[PDB]
């Protein structure tokens, strides 16, 4: 509660900024092709990532470009990370999530830029995309979006504003959404009614990702025991899911959140499972894999209807 004073203050800052946009005091810029924004009130986690890729796959008959912010990316300036699947920089220069999204989306372009509009402009010149997806774009009101998709998990609904809680914005800001996606339905189911189009999102275990980021069956470990490891401190997350997946684990290792694997040294002939975020650093090594999940969205056909209305 030491943090509540900043919380009450932070609320007035955000509300003031939001009031300026609401009332048209600040410029909202428009790119000349459709833009879909995906974001949340709280910080975006694996949920937003899973949904961004799910969404880009619904749009597989369009030239798609993801506009990411580039958190933990050296400096600034617009950067093309991936051209329709082909990575143009290392994960160092681009950050893990845009790199990971790039690796998981073989036909999608990825551009990292703090100013999303300037990113869109570069993409338009060099990539000629037909639709943009704003990764983590709900707060970036300076760029117009034709479809504003807000992800909400159960925990959000009873959270509080930074720094006392995790909300980047008050719950009332939901009004800005054109569509709601209720996430983590596999773990923490809930029902929310706003009168806006709403879609329950489940994630389910699909297959394995090898070190080239291709899907492989998990059947390979039908009669094998596995070593596993993680860095971020998500190993309890990883530990639980592995436990929840009933996978034979021989041994289990832990590393700092940031771990770069400049000196990771695995054993020839053993099999490893790690997180996609860590797998990034371990390309080159076979026998190292990540768990792959797929999104199942209720009323999928409605979402698709909403999406394609932006193309008129």
Strands 109-112 and 79-83: antiparallel
Determine if 39 is a binding residue for Cl ion (CB under 5 A).
Answer: no
Find out whether 43 is annotated in a ligand binding site: yes
Distance CA 123, CA 119 (A): 6
Distance CA 132, CA 140 (A): 14
Find out whether 48 is annotated in a ligand binding site: yes
Find out whether 7 is annotated in a ligand binding site: no
- The count of chain residues that interact with Cl ion, using the rule CB under 5 A, is 3
Distance CA 305, CA 153 (A): 23
Give the shortest CB-173-to-Cl ion separation in angstroms.
16
Stretch that binds Cl ion, among 8-16, 37-45, 209-217, 237-245 (CB under 5 A): 37-45
Determine if 203 is a binding residue for Cl ion (CB under 5 A).
Answer: no
Give the shortest CB-58-to-Cl ion separation in angstroms.
18
Find out whether 165 is annotated in a ligand binding site: no
Determine if 47 is a binding residue for Cl ion (CB under 5 A).
Answer: yes
Closest C-alpha to 35, from 57, 66, 68? 66
Determine if 165 is a binding residue for Cl ion (CB under 5 A).
Answer: no
Determine if 119 is a binding residue for Cl ion (CB under 5 A).
Answer: no
Nearer to Cl ion, 141 or 203 (CB): 203
Find out whether 46 is annotated in a ligand binding site: yes
- Would you say how long the chain is, in residues? 312
Give the shortest CB-266-to-Cl ion separation in angstroms.
30
The residue whose Cβ lies closest to Cl ion is 47
Determine if 45 is a binding residue for Cl ion (CB under 5 A).
Answer: yes
Stretch that binds Cl ion, among 7-15, 17-25, 42-50, 290-298 (CB under 5 A): 42-50
Distance CA 68, CA 48 (A): 12
Determine if 48 is a binding residue for Cl ion (CB under 5 A).
Answer: yes
DSSP annotation string for 31-42: -SS-EEEEEESS
Stretch that binds Cl ion, among 38-46, 164-172, 201-209, 243-251 (CB under 5 A): 38-46
| C-alpha pair distances (Å), 214 with each of 17, 35, 82, 110, 141 | 43, 28, 16, 18, 35
Cis peptide before 163 (omega within 30 of 0): yes
Is residue 214 a contact partner of residue 292, using CB atoms and an 8 Å limit? no
Binding residues: 42-49
- Name the residues that contact Cl ion, by CB under 5 A: 45, 47-48
């Amino acid at each position: 509660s030491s943090l509540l004073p900043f919380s009450y203050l932070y609320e007035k800052i955000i509300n003031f900024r939001n009031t300026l946009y609401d009332k048209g005091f600040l410029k909202i810029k428009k790119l000349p092709v459709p833009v879909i924004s995906v974001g949340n009130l709280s910080v975006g986690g694996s949920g937003k990532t899973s949904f961004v890729m799910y969404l880009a796959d619904l749009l597989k008959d369009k030239r798609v470009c993801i506009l990411s912010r580039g958190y933990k990316r050296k400096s600034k300036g617009t950067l093309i990370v991936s051209e329709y699947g082909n990575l143009k920089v290392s994960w160092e220069e681009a950050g893990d999530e845009p790199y990971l999204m790039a690796k998981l989306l073989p036909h999608v372009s990825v551009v990292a830029s703090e100013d999303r509009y300037k990113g869109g402009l570069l993409a338009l010149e060099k990539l000629s995309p037909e639709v943009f997806i704003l990764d983590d774009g709900f707060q970036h009101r300076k760029l117009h979006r034709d479809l504003n998709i807000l992800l909400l998990k159960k925990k959000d609904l009873k959270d509080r504003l930074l720094p006392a809680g995790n909300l980047r914005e008050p719950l009332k800001e939901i009004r800005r959404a054109d569509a709601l996606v209720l996430t983590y339905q596999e773990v923490e189911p809930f029902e929310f009614f706003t009168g806006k189009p709403t879609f329950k999102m489940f994630r389910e275990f699909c297959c394995l990702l090898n070190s080239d980021f291709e899907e492989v069956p998990f059947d390979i470990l039908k009669e094998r025991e596995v070593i596993a490891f993680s860095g971020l401190g998500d190993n309890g997350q990883f530990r639980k899911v592995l436990k929840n997946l009933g996978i034979k684990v021989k041994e289990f290792m832990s590393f700092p959140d940031h771990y770069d694997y400049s000196d990771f040294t695995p054993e020839e002939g053993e099999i490893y499972l790690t997180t996609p975020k860590d797998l990034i650093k371990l390309q080159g090594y076979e026998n190292v894999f990540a768990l792959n999940f797929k999104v199942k969205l209720e009323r999928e056909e409605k979402l698709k209807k909403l999406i394609y209305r932006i193309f008129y």
